[PDB]
Design a protein around this ligand. Structure first.
Ligand SMILES: [Mg+2]
Ligand SMILES: [Mg+2]
Length: 346
RNA sequence: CAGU
């Protein structure tokens, strides 16, 4: 891309094949994703985690929360399982950067996975924004990402509500998830990022509510972030729940890819919190709730990172641009692929 | 930059 910026990066053949062929998501991948929301294997994993860590922290409170794509219903059989281990009722505590205690806890847990004959330690990432332990649960073979941060569980619950209220959202996310993998873009643009882009797009079509309109104040807080939401019936908002049909899905996907092919990433951001068209990067910070403003006043270093090629704001952790690591050339690659994909969908 |  960098060598020939003037050339539209060719949509990879693996992607072209799947776009030109949409019945697979509707008839096969959807039922598997729906089944993967609840399977017996997850109970074994949570139980074995409690059994493994209960001795390491004897009197301490302990609770395990599942989240991620398997739980929201856009997973596949190879999908990893994401788990939040809360030791000591830290659910409501927000760490911008992982604290010493948090890193201390992760280090203690690392040893337990190594020594245990039911777990294989795969990786221990301490210096990430969200430190995680990557380990294989050997009885099931399921790869688990273990963290000490509640935010992923909270946005998983929000996706659950959105997908169940408007199933078209779920189908589209399964499709673009697979499209992202066949385009080999997942390392720059994550499945979670594209899910927020789908949600935002459908908000602009008046098929989903702005997240802010679900949070009119009693607030549940993880630090400064409002993590609960009114589970309002879509009828009360006049939001029609569409029947997901292959033509309906195809038309919305076409429009989705067309929209992000022409989106002005230099001046606007994807903003499911606001859920309105043309949210300017230059205006967004003054549009956020009072807790965000109070938090960044005391900590200006924790404001959302807006000076990035691609800005997609987490609807709950409002200081997180989930696409902050996307490069100009990764963005151009994504824009070119959107362009060619919209064409192939007519 | 790494879970989501
Ligand atoms: Mg996952
Ligand atoms: Mg994971």
């Amino acid at each position: 891309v960098k060598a020939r910026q003037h050339i539209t990066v060719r949509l990879p053949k693996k992607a072209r094949a799947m776009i030109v062929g949409i019945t697979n998501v509707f008839k096969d991948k959807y039922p598997i994703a729906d089944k993967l929301k609840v399977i017996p294997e997850y109970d074994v994993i949570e139980q074995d985690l409690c059994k493994l860590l209960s001795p390491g922290f004897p009197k301490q409170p302990l609770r395990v929360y599942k989240f991620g794509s398997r739980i929201t219903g856009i997973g596949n059989r190879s999908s990893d399982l994401d788990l939040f281990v809360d030791i000591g009722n830290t659910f409501h505590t927000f760490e911008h950067r992982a604290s010493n205690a948090t890193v201390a806890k992760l280090r203690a847990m690392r040893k337990f996975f190594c020594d245990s004959e039911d777990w294989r330690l795969i990786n221990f990432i301490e210096q990430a924004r969200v430190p995680i332990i990557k380990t294989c649960h050997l009885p099931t073979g399921i790869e688990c990402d273990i963290c000490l941060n509640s935010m992923g569980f909270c946005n998983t619950n929000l996706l659950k509500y959105i997908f169940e209220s408007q199933p078209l959202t779920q189908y589209m996310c399964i499709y673009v998830k697979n499209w992202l993998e066949r385009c080999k873009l997942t390392e720059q643009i994550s499945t979670y990022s594209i899910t927020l882009m789908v949600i935002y797009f459908l908000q602009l079509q008046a098929l989903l509510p702005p997240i802010a309109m679900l949070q009119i104040e009693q607030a549940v807080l993880v630090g400064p972030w409002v993590v609960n939401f009114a589970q309002k019936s879509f009828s009360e908002l006049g939001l029609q729940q569409l029947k997901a049909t292959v033509p309906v899905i195809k038309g919305f996907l076409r429009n989705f890819f067309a929209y992000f092919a022409k989106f002005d990433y230099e001046h606007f951001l994807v903003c499911p919190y606001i859920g309105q068209a043309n949210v300017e990067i230059a205006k967004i910070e003054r549009m956020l709730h009072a807790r965000y403003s109070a938090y960044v006043s005391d900590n200006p270093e924790c404001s959302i990172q807006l000076k990035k090629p691609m800005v997609v704001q987490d609807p709950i952790q409002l200081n997180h641009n989930v696409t902050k690591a996307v490069t100009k050339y990764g963005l151009q690659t994504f824009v070119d692929y959107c362009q060619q994909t919209a064409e192939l969908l007519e």
